Design a protein around this ligand. Sequence first.
Ligand SMILES: O=C(O)C(C(=O)O)c1ccccc1
Length: 105
Amino acid sequence: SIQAEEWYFGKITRRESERLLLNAENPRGTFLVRESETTKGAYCLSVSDFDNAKGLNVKHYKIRKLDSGGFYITSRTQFNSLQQLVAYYSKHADGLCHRLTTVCP
Ligand SMILES: O=C(O)C(C(=O)O)c1ccccc1
């Protein structure tokens, strides 16, 4: 049950997610999952990143959900639950800016 997850921030805007993530104390991969502002039934994975080029910054990835049950960022890599998706991206960076490391404070 996604709403019970401490990383699920629910109905917060993109700007608020950036306010929370743009904190000097957050290491790369600090994240949160929220609802998409404009896509009904889709969620967003907001992730903090850091490089010497851009410094501290935030990326937003859309998580699609199938009525057939799967969750995914890219259709080639699907999961049975949002929880499994988070667990997989905590170990593989794949196309994300960084692997998921710590839940946003
Ligand atoms: O869906 C949106 O409106 C939105 C957002 O809420 O920032 C978004 C846009 C691109 C990727 C993830 C999320």
